[PDB]
Amino acid sequence: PQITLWQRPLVTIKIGGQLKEALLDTGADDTVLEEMSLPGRWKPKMIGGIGGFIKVRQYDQILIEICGHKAIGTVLVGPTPVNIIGRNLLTQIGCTLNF
Amino acid sequence: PQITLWQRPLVTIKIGGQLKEALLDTGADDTVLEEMSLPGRWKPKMIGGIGGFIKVRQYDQILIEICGHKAIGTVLVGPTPVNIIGRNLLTQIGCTLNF
Ligand SMILES: O=S(=O)(c1ccccc1)N(Cc1ccc(I)cc1)[C@H]1CNC[C@@H]1N(Cc1ccc(I)cc1)S(=O)(=O)c1ccccc1
Ligand SMILES: [Cl-]
Ligand SMILES: [Cl-]
Ligand SMILES: [Cl-]
Q: A98 forms bridges with which residues in the sheet? A: B2, B96
B67 → chain A, closest CA residue: A99
> How far, in whole angstroms, is CA B74 from its chain's centroid?
9
**Residue B32 burial (C-beta neighbours within 10 Å; 0-12, 13-18, 19+):** buried
Cβ-contact B31, B73 below 8 angstroms: yes
For ligand 1, atom 17, which residue shows the shortest CA distance? A49
CA distance B40 to chain A (A): 25
Alpha carbons B46 and B56: distance in angstroms, whole number: 6
- Report which residue type is found at B59: Y
Tell me the three state secondary structure of residue A18: strand
* Contact (CB<8Å) A26/B26: yes
What are the sequence ranges of the domains in chain B? 1-99
Half-sphere exposure (CA, 13 Å, Cβ side) for B83? 19
Q: What torsion, rounded to 10 degrees, do the Cα atoms A81, A85, A88, A91 define?
A: -160
Alpha carbons B25 and B86: distance in angstroms, whole number: 5
* Contact (CB<8Å) B27/A29: no
The CATH class that applies to domain B1-99 reads: mainly beta
Q: What torsion, rounded to 10 degrees, do the Cα atoms B37, B42, B47, B51 define?
A: 40
φ, ψ of residue B90 to 5 degrees: the values are -60, -40
Q: What is the DSSP letter of A17?
A: T
Technique behind the model? X-ray
B85 → chain A, closest CA residue: A27
Question: What resolution, expressed in A, was reported for this entry?
Answer: 1.4
Ligand 1 and A89: CB distance under 6 A: no
Q: A96 forms bridges with which residues in the sheet? A: B98
